[PDB]
Amino acid sequence: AVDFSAHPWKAPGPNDSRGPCPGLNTLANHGFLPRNGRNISVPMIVKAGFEGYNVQSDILILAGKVGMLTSREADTISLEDLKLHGTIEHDASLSREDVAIGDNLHFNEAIFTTLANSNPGADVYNISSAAQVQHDRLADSVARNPNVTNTDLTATIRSSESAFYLTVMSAGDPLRGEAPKKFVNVFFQEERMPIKEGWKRSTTPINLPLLGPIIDRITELSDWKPTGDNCGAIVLGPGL
Template identity: 45%
Template sequence: MNKALVFAFVALFALASAYPKDRNGKFIIDPSKHDYIAPGPNDVRAPCPALNTLANHGHLPRNGKNITKTDLIYGLFNGLNVGRDIGFILAEGAFKKFDNPAVLDLEMLQKHNAIEHDASMTRNDNALGDSTVVNATLLDALIASSADGKVLNWRDMVAHRLRRQADSVERNPTFVWNEAQKEAAAGEVAIFQLVFGSWWSGVEIATADSILRHERFPDGWKPHEGTVLLADVLPLTALVRLKI
């Protein structure tokens, strides 16, 4: 077996063993520790609304600092029910961009083309402004892309993404849009739909607005029962990739 795969399996097993479970094997989450708390003046955030939401709810360190790979993998798993296979890949990729430090701060992910990329659906390009805060004009345009005004589906998001790409080409003299950026952008659409709604029915506008504008889970929101796995995401990412 490939040594990298062996390492991955061993690492995932070690991670799984480190967290308490109930008798059914599910991880024990204390809801009282995951209320929304807005970031304070000394807290830092990323150019990613999902990671910021996890920090605002305590699934990642609330100050956004000193985050380990384990924190990231289990923040995604416990907060969003994103599979550890996806979490492991995302954590490895993010940490590798910084030569594999022991910990990361969320603001470090603002580094261009780490996880941040040009033509974000709701953020400025790094060359044009602060990518760690939402651009309300861009978000309003995304919400307005909804065909029925009730949900934001993947086709709506693709339409908005194409407009954003054209806008960045026109306004950003350092615009970068290679295969890596296209793959990341397509994956964002797929994961957003699967985590916060459904590929077939879309994401409710109120949910999308809460996550993308306020970086907060809607009241009463819970992750889907079924874990979102890499096998779910890859074919949908490939479909979106064909459209952008």
């Protein structure tokens, strides 16, 4: 079918567009998406997500078209466009800072420490660990960011993203909702598929039916509460 030896990892160059998403960045770093990270359409994301991760079109079409809002182009984005705050990009990221008090675009090792330290005693991250991380990340934003946005919508996106790293970077069936720390850490830290370390694309399709109960369970265990107005309104386009 598809050859991963034909999709080598290469570090992004100075003019390669990268965004706040390790999922799409990794695909770009492997040429599943254009290495320059530009002129990326939803069909390209669908194909790239399938080929790279076995993530199905249901979630990628839905998230894809929302992400398209971040650009000024008709049907494409640069990966960096996705940093636009309040479309998808949200406070209390796993590996980026809140835009009001820092860089919401680039990987940040200090931020990532909370996740990297989660689930002490196991060699995997799992649903309970992901939930604790989300709780701790949100508490941090509430403590240090007086403009924190925390809504039903941001909470759901956050849980989705956790479900993604648990499933896409899994060793076993993605259903189990657990992934080796060695895989997940390479994914975030280097935005690389950890092939060397033993990772293989899931042979189980990762789609909304599979992700949905993982997402809800992460949310449930995270002891989440809304902030302020709880308005789930998205930013519809740049420079508004």
